[PDB]
């Protein structure tokens, strides 16, 4: 009924974000939404009550998961999957202002940003999710499963660490270093919500991945990011 009422009379402009109070992927969208200056309203779906089952929500996101975004200005267009939401946001911002904030007007750069974005959504987040699952929520304890996924997460963080280290090495020839085109992009921001969750699986970023540490801290100090995470 709660969510049902919302779809009774939807806003005419702005954005509505469906998420969950402890969903890193939700904050990933909130962050980009905030950085781009997009005004939005967040609805925290109560999965316990099965609000994600509400025919109204499944219609927004057939996968029945969060986040899902409704672009009211575009006839209530619904975009699901955090990766697709980010691309929708930077593409829209760019065509509206002519300024590719957190993005790039260059095909070559966009493909590099996409590579990191797909790497994050497909190789980073899913793995952190599996490690958390076997470490805390599986029907039985499986040490071999925990080790498999925890190792993979450290491995992917090593890929990020190495890339950041190489970017620094190139400049030297504490200054902020970024993954693509020496500028902050959604490729960097996408990791932020999760870099804060990996401690739960025994990973200490500050000590284990120095470069990732500086990188994440630079982003955590940005107003738009602080505002989004406080939401």
Ligand X SMILES: N[C@@H](CCC(=O)N[C@@H](CS)C(=O)NCC(=O)O)C(=O)O
The distance of closest approach from Cβ of residue 19 to ligand X in the complex, given in angstroms and rounded to an integer, is 8
Residue 97: Cβ-neighbour burial (10 angstroms; 0-12, 13-18, 19+): exposed
The contact pattern for ligand X, residues 143-162, with x = CB under 6 A and - = no contact, is --------------------
Out of 11, 123, 176, 181, the only residue in the binding site for ligand X (CB under 6 A) is 123
Q: Which stretch binds a second copy (CB under 8 A): 3-11, 42-50, 135-143, 196-204?
A: 135-143
Sheet holding 40-44, edge to edge: 40-44, 15-19, 68-71, 77-80
Nearer to ligand X, 20 or 135 (CB): 20
Exposure of 94 in the CB half-sphere (CA atoms within 13 A): 15
The site partner of 220 among a second copy, ligand X, none (C-beta below 5 to 8 Å per kind) is none
Interface with ligand X includes 47 (CB under 6 A)? yes
The contact pattern for a second copy, residues 79-98, with x = CB under 8 A and - = no contact, is xxxxxx--xx--xx--x---
Q: Is 35 annotated as a binding residue?
A: no
Out of 21, 122, 171, 227, the only residue in the binding site for a second copy (CB under 8 A) is 122
Out of 11, 123, 181, 231, the only residue in the binding site for a second copy (CB under 8 A) is 123
String of DSSP letters for 170-228: HH-------SBTTB--HHHHTTHHHHTTGGGGT--HHHH-HHHHHHHHHHHTSHHHHHH
Interface with a second copy includes 50 (CB under 8 A)? no
Tell me the C-alpha distance between 144 and 148, whole Å: 6
The distance of closest approach from Cβ of residue 188 to a second copy in the complex, given in angstroms and rounded to an integer, is 15
Contact 158, 167 (CB under 8 A): no
CA angle 12, 32, 82 (to 5 degrees): 85
| Contact residues for ligand X, defined by CB under 6 A | 20, 23-25, 47, 65-67, 81-83, 121-123
């Amino acid at each position: 009924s709660r969510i049902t009422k919302f779809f009774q009379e939807q806003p005419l402009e702005g954005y509505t974000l469906f998420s969950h109070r402890s969903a890193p992927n939700g904050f990933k969208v909130a962050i980009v939404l905030s950085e781009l200056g997009f005004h939005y309203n967040t609805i925290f779906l109560d999965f316990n009550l099965g609000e994600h089952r509400a025919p109204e929500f499944v219609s927004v996101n057939p996968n029945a998961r969060v986040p899902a975004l409704i672009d009211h200005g575009m006839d209530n267009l619904s975009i699901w999957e955090s990766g697709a939401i980010l691309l929708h946001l930077v593409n829209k911002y760019y065509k509206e202002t002519g300024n590719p904030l957190l993005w790039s007007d260059d095909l070559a750069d966009q493909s590099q940003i996409n590579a990191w974005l797909f790497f994050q959504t497909s190789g980073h987040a899913p793995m952190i999710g599996q490690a958390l699952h076997f470490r805390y929520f599986h029907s039985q304890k499986i040490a071999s499963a925990v080790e498999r996924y925890t190792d993979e997460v450290r491995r992917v963080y090593g890929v990020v660490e190495m890339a950041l280290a190489e970017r620094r090495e190139a400049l030297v020839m504490d200054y902020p270093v970024w993954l693509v085109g020496d500028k902050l992009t959604i490729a960097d921001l996408a990791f932020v919500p999760w870099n804060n969750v990996v401690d739960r699986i025994g990973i200490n970023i500050k000590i284990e991945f120095p470069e990732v540490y500086k990188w994440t801290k630079h982003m955590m100090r940005r107003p738009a990011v602080i505002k989004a995470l406080r939401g």
